[PDB]
Design a protein around this ligand. Structure first.
Ligand SMILES: CCCCCCCCCC(=O)OCCCOC(=O)CCCCCCCCC
Ligand SMILES: [Ca+2]
Ligand SMILES: [Ca+2]
Ligand code: NA
Lengths: 10, 480, 948, 99, 10
């Protein structure tokens, strides 16, 4: 499916 | 109560949309893919850059821990197929001008080339037929490689001399430069027939009698039309420098090779470390292993060379680097003639061309008279090592999807037969500029990435999509 | 009425209003069989979902038709297109109704006899009826004046064992808690400002996130004016609600105002009447998402940081360039004080109805309905780059990885305009013949719906804080949109009746819609229902035990059309969606159109829903024990849908008629009155619902699967041909042929399986409510529990607290090195597949990654169990004795104390959210999950009523 | 001869009644104008709806009046450029305009 | 004043 997310920072 | 109101008022009448309104979409579509997320993951596979320590967007690509459900090229597959290739299909139905048809057939044939270099296999014979066939067969890579060179030939033989009448943001209606872009893709697709040993007599025949001609392009084959505003930048900079934060640092194989040669291209797209002001690449897939050995406070982003994004906001998307074009000639001069002096000045012109594009014109002497001098190149294979390993540099920050492709065909740069952990534990072992299989590696067979997954959108709705295979299994033309 | 042949519930205004919700449906949550009612979030102003007998529409239109008098009422919803980076919900069409104006509500749950309202009734009907003028004593003035408080209902359960840090090691700037076990030692933290650093003891603060929240507060005022004569009646009302929620500052705001004036006059055979209503709302929403939003920023706090110690911006270490962490988050107080997300709506809706009785048996009825809205959204974010980048750690010191890249500011504004007209011309005929009774009704219906908007946006703000379209040096973006749809229909409804014992009803209707292909616009659908009051022929004694006994059965169809503009091809201004951005035309000076990606069709036929239903209703002993049961079998067929297609075909979707989506179910209501003296009464109610969703076929030419909502390379929810709607697929760990989890030979961490697995669906397995009402003289006490069990739902709240090291689950093994219990290594050279006992541990250094990815479940771990038991509402009401209202102007006085959403109890697997959340709206795609939606809330208030 | 005859239809309807304690008035008006300039470019459509009422009870009287008005105008733009009438007045006296 | 005004053609 479409939408996209980013990972965090650390 | 009029019921005949179902023509969408938000879009033009289908008559009014002409071939000149559709054609500019084709290049921009292709550019948004191969200069964006394809270019992106190819830069990891070619080992130009690596995941920044303090962020995590691309762990899965660095460590080859991605699978088919990760959808690592599902955007670009939708873009190249449901975008560029369908529009190219429509242009070809809406205009009879042979010049415009030539210029679309090249752009179309370039897309199939890119998708084949990714999955070795692509729908072709039956693609773009809509509801008459929702489930296209996936052609073997060379029915389509031989297919689309058969197209480019036929559309070339239809030219009657008349000009182009569609907006052309690659060449500005200069059909001379479309001549050279078509022959240049012939040069690069012929070479891979050879180094895959399919009709290797006939395609060496033709690479002899197409470098015969120098009938190639001048300059670079690009889409340079980007502004640093919104939805108008370079796709790769857009994704990675406004949508994300910085995730890219320079990788160990490139950074060491360029330090080894004292290259000043060292600084174009690559920053000194924020801690000691030196050039440090991170060994492939070694993000997590280095903070385990060195400690958390001692492998932050300040201890590795960041990828400078600032030069990319407006920076063009390249489909065919000039410096690459003459590196390919230089290799046919050194291999299929044996014209050393001619090879030497194709090589020297690939370096001089690159040096100028990065703003270091006049300093190619630093590579052409030193470590990478054509003087010290003993063997025949020593010269080609020089040709290929200066090709590989030339494509950094320019055309990563090819850089990785050509790495697989010539298989130089080569896999340092030493693991990432060894090279960590004593550097003196590593020959600068050869590739390190990722420290963490999700390919059961080990090695270097050779083949992107297949589109999950194809997997789910198209039953005739080839069965998923590990990344380890080569594309049809990689035989070694 | 109640010669009806299918399931229907009726609620009185008093019950609707007693809860004192601003909304009319949310107080009915968990209280009616077959009527699933959730609120998208406890954020003031948010939408409400009402779903009757499961999802039938895959294309996201499953709310019942609301019908106010009886003019259909706009139910549009305003919520974020992008739930992932900017989630917000500004409300629902029905949220406009004043609860105090409701006389009766009657939910039609059957889709078999819908000829009176056409297609949109297949999803159900909420028939509302408003109060009219009545002669009472003395003046006709009712005042209601309330006050309410919000408090956080449930925050995720945190570990308090490890503080700021990563890899197990102490840092001074982490957004997480993978540090060492608290010492009580003193350890520096935060960025360094003026060559000075903050320095505090290294110990947990387990209330840091809880202290962050304020107490919500809300006041309301409604007045009505009422009067009638033997010929006319007149009713005028005004309501007003102001809420500032649980979240610090004004950011969480809803203001509602309504005004209504209804009236009728009868003169001879003719009656004319009119109803006109105005509604104004002003929302402010604290946006959710994965970027620099409040909640995301708030959960990414180390467990040792004092969050309220960050509000004072006069302390430089809390200013954005020195905020203690740089990793994709900001000071939550800064976000809520300096971002803007606001909505305003003005709305007018009304009816004109004229009745004319003629020739003994006939009645002519003309009814006209109008509903028009203009709403205005305004969103801004500051140019963080210009304000804070240079010279600061967070900052120029972070380079391309600063949170301020490329946060260069943005401002947009949208005005949307909606308008619906409905027209009904009906003649009704009613004649008793001997014992029989005949009622016939033929009518014409005409309808026209129209929405439009215009949208403008500028980026890169010259003056970094001013939100105006003048404040940019770069190109503006402008978008405009309109759709228009029309429909007429003829219908007929014959109801026959013998001795008040058999009832029979026949409905037929034929529609012509504008959204179907020209050569196939007309669709027809009949129905048939029967009622049998078999009490009326029992013994003389045997019918002294059975007060009432009815059996009912319906079989019928309901046709349906398509959404606008799904037949013809389209060429769009050419744009390319890339990961986290676009590359759109014009470039550079050239415009370009691209073949649109949804292939259209002129093959489409109309939708058709077929439903069968039987029901039984019995009451016993004075109606001291009563039940209603119903069984339904409903098949939505050939619904028009953009079905995913392989982009290599040249389109990503084709518009076709699907197969059947079936919902079968049991609806059970059971009431009884154990005690009814004259001063005391005790009532108990139990309602029960079970629905079975099954997609029966999606056209196999295009596969048998299409995404409904999904993350690229992550958890996606589908509709699959053999399964219930809303099957999730997620990544799972690979396992060898005997069930042990294969693990990487060097890291210790799980290896991904080659495919995603199925991991549950969105559907509850059952739903039930249990409630009790105590009446003693004029005190009342109501208590209502709501029970939803089964099914699964994605939750970023768990995803982020796992990734953060804050979830209690992550303090597993006391974070000492560990081997995944019952793990193996896969040993495969070429073609020989073998498994060996795993010996590799997961290091302290790598424990963060193990949990960040989800433990041994991998990403499927962040499917959470949607189950809960909830103390939905309690209401304690005291009618003051009329004798104390004699020297007063007051005809009646009732003070009332109530609580909503009071406690929630969930399975052990879920210590993170109230499952009644979403970030994707109040329909189908809402079921995908919540994306760090704001924490749900506990409400409790008073209300004072005064009649004059 | 370039000009047409404008044409305009109108329809108004009202309803009223009272008692000795109340009154009610509800009205509808529609107006459709297409002016003398050829084509539909002179166009004015007016629609109004209004409903007012009162009710006395004792010493208290409450009344309300709520009115809705709709309008769609189409103007034949005037002025010195490529406007209609400017274009029309700049015609030689021998030129047939309706041709 | 303000506001321009063009001559005609002839
Ligand atoms: C006794 C009166 C019966 C009047 C009955 C009128 C019936 C025609 C409706 C119609 O064909 O389709 C309705 C679609 C939308 O209607 C409009 O857009 C409204 C058009 C304008 C209608 C004005 C109605 C004025 C009534 C006072
Ligand atoms: Ca607040
Ligand atoms: Ca006219
Ligand atoms: Na397209």
């Amino acid at each position: 499916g479409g939408g996209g997310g980013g990972g965090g920072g650390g | 109560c009029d019921l005949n109101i179902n023509d969408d008022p938000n879009y033009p009448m289908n008559d009014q949309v002409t071939a000149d309104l559709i054609f500019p979409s084709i290049s921009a579509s292709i550019a948004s893919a191969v200069g964006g997320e394809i270019y992106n993951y190819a830069g990891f596979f070619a080992q130009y850059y690596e995941q920044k320590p303090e962020s995590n967007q691309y762990n899965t690509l660095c460590e080859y821990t991605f699978t088919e459900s990760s959808q690592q090229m599902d955007y670009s597959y939708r873009i190249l197929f449901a975008g560029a290739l369908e529009d190219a299909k429509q242009v070809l139905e809406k205009t009879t001008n042979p010049a415009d048809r030539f210029a679309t057939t090249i752009l179309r044939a370039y897309a199939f080339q890119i998708m084949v270099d990714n999955t070795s296999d692509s729908p072709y014979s039956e693609a773009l037929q809509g509801n008459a066939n929702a489930t296209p067969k996936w052609d073997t890579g060379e029915t389509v490689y031989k297919g689309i060179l058969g197209e480019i030939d036929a559309a070339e033989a239809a030219l009657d001399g008349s000009g182009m009448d569609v907006p052309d943001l690659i060449f500005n209606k200069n059909i001379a430069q479309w001549k050279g872009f078509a022959n240049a893709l012939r040069l690069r697709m012929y070479l891979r027939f050879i180094d895959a040993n399919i009709d290797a007599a006939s395609y060496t025949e033709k690479v002899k009698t197409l470098v015969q001609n120098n009938e190639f392009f001048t300059g670079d084959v690009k889409l340079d039309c980007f502004l640093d505003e919104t939805d108008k930048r370079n796709p790769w900079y857009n994704t990675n420098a406004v949508g994300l934060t910085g995730n890219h640092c320079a990788a160990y194989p490139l950074v060491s090779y360029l330090s080894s040669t004292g290259d000043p291209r060292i600084a174009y797209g690559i920053s000194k470390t924020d801690a000691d002001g030196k050039y440090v690449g991170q060994l492939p897939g070694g993000k997590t292993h280095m903070q385990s050995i060195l400690g958390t406070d001692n492998w932050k982003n300040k201890n590795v060379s960041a990828i400078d994004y600032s030069i990319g906001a407006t920076k063009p998307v390249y489909f065919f680097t000039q410096a690459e074009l003459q590196f390919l000639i230089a290799e046919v001069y050194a291999r299929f003639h044996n014209d050393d002096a001619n090879a030497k000045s194709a090589y020297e012109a690939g370096v001089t061309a690159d040096f100028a594009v990065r703003g270091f014109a006049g300093q190619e002497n630093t590579i052409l008279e030193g470590a990478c001098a054509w003087s010290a190149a003993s063997t025949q294979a020593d010269k080609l090592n020089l040709i290929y390993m200066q090709k590989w540099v030339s494509l950094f920050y320019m055309d990563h999807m090819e850089a990785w492709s050509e790495i697989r065909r010539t298989d130089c740069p080569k896999l340092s037969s030493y693991s990432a952990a060894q090279i960590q534990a004593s550097e003196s072992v590593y020959t600068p500029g050869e590739l390190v299989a990722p420290w963490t590696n999700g390919l059961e067979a080990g090695g270097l990435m050779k083949r992107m997954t297949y589109p999950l959108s194809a997997r789910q709705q198209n039953v005739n999509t080839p069965a998923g295979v590990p990344g380890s299994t080569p594309v049809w033309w990689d035989i070694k | 009425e109640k010669a009806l042949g299918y399931a229907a519930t009726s609620v009185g205004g008093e019950k609707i209003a007693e809860s004192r919700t601003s909304d009319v449906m949310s107080s009915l949550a968990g209280k009616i069989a077959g009527v699933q009612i959730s609120s998208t979030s406890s954020d003031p102003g948010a939408s409400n979902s009402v779903i009757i007998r499961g999802v039938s529409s895959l294309s996201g239109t499953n709310q019942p038709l609301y019908v106010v008098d009886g003019v259909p009422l706009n139910n549009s919803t305003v919520y974020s297109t992008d739930g992932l980076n900017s989630g917000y919900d500004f409300g629902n069409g029905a949220n406009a109704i004043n609860p105090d104006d409701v006389a009766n509500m009657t939910i039609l749950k059957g889709a078999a006899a819908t000829a009176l309202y056409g297609s949109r009734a297949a999803n159900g009907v909420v028939m509302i009826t408003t109060k009219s003028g009545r002669k009472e004593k003395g003046v006709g003035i009712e005042y209601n004046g309330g006050v309410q408080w919000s408090t956080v209902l449930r925050l995720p359960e945190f570990q308090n064992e490890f503080g700021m840090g990563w890899n197990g090691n102490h840092t001074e700037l982490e957004n997480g808690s993978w540090g060492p076990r608290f010492d009580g030692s003193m350890q520096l933290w935060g960025n360094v400002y003026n060559n000075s650093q903050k320095l505090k003891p290294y110990v947990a603060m387990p209330d840091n996130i809880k202290d962050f929240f304020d107490a919500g507060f809300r006041y309301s005022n409604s007045l009505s004016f009422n009067g009638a004569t033997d010929k006319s009646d007149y009713y005028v009302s005004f309501s007003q609600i102001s809420d500032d929620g649980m979240i610090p500052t004004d950011a969480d705001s809803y203001d509602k105002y309504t005004f209504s004036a209804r009236g009728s006059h009868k003169a001879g055979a003719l009656t004319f009447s009119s109803s006109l209503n105005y509604a104004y709302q002003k929302n402010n929403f604290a946006t959710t998402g994965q970027g620099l939003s409040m909640l995301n920023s708030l959960y990414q706090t180390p467990r040792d940081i004092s969050i309220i110690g960050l509000e004072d911006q006069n302390d430089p270490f809390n200013t954005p360039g020195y905020y203690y962490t740089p990793y994709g988050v900001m000071n939550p107080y800064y976000i809520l004080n300096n971002y803007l997300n606001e909505y305003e709506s003005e709305r007018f809706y009304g009816k004109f109805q004229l009745d004319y009785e003629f020739l003994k048996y006939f009645k002519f009825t003309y009814r006209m309905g109008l509903d028009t809205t203009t709403g205005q959204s305004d969103k801004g974010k500051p140019n963080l780059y210009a304000l804070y980048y240079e010279g600061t750690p967070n900052g120029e010191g972070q380079g391309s990885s600063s949170p301020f890249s490329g946060e260069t500011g943005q401002y947009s504004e949208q005005i949307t305009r909606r308008r619906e007209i409905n027209q009904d011309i009906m003649v009704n005929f009613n004649m008793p013949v001997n014992d029989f009774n005949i009622n016939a009704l033929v009518g014409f219906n005409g309808n026209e719906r129209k929405v439009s908007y215009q949208y403008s946006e500028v980026n890169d703000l010259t003056i970094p804080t001013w939100f105006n379209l003048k404040n940019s040096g770069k190109t503006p973006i402008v978008e405009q949109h309109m759709e228009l749809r029309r429909l007429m229909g003829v219908f007929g409804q014959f109801e026959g009746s013998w001795k008040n014992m058999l009832y029979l009803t026949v409905t037929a209707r034929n529609d012509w819609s504008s959204t179907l292909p020209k050569e196939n616009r007309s669709f027809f659908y009949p129905g048939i229902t029967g009622s049998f009051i078999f009490s009326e022929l029992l013994n003389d004694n045997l019918q002294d035990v059975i007060t009432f006994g009815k059996i009912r059965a319906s079989w019928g169809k309901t046709g349906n059309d398509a959404d606008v503009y799904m037949v013809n091809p389209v060429y769009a201004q050419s744009s390319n969606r890339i990961p986290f951005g676009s590359l759109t035309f014009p470039l550079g000076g050239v415009n370009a159109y691209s073949a649109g990606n949804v292939l259209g069709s002129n093959t489409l036929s109309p939708e058709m829903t077929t439903e069968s239903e039987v029901g039984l209703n019995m009451a016993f002993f004075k109606n001291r024990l009563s039940f209603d049961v119903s069984y339904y079998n409903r098949n939505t067929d050939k619904q028009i849908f953009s079905l995913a297609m392989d982009p290599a075909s040249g389109y990503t979707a084709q518009n076709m008629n699907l197969g059947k989506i079936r919902n079968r179910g049991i609806e059970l209501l059971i009431s009884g009155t154990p005690i009814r003296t004259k001063d005391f009464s005790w009532e108990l109610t139990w309602n029960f619902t079970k629905n079975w969703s099954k997609v029966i076929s999606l056209p196999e030419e295009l596969g048998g699967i299409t995404t409904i909502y999904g993350l690229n390379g992550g958890t996606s929810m589908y509709a699959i041909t053999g399964m219930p709607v809303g099957v999730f697929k997620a990544q799972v760990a690979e396992r060898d042929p005997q069930g042990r989890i294969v693990v990487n030979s060097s890291t210790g961490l799980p290896v991904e399986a080659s495919e995603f697995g199925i991991c549950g669906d969105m559907n509850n397995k059952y739903q039930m409510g249990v409630s009790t009402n105590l009446k003693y003289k004029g005190i009342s006490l109501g208590i209502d529990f709501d029970i939803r069990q089964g099914g699964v739902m994605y939750s970023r709240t768990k995803d982020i607290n796992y990734f953060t090291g804050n979830a209690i689950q992550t303090a597993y093994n006391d974070r000492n090195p560990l081997i995944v219990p019952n793990s193996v290594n896969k040993i495969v050279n070429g073609e020989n597949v073998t498994y060996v006992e795993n010996t590799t541990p997961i290091t302290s250094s790598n424990i963060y990654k193990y949990w960040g990815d989800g433990g041994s479940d991998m990403g499927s771990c962040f499917l959470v169990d949607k189950s809960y038991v909830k103390l939905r509402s309690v209401v304690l009401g005291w009618d003051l004795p009329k004798r104390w209202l004699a020297k007063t102007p007051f005809q009646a006085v009732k003070v009332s104390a109530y609580g909503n959403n009071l406690f929630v109890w969930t399975p052990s697997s879920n210590t993170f959210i109230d499952p009644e959340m979403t970030s994707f709206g109040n329909d189908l795609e809402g079921n995908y999950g919540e994306y760090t939606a704001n924490p749900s809330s506990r409400r409790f208030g008073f209300n004072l009523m005064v009649k004059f």
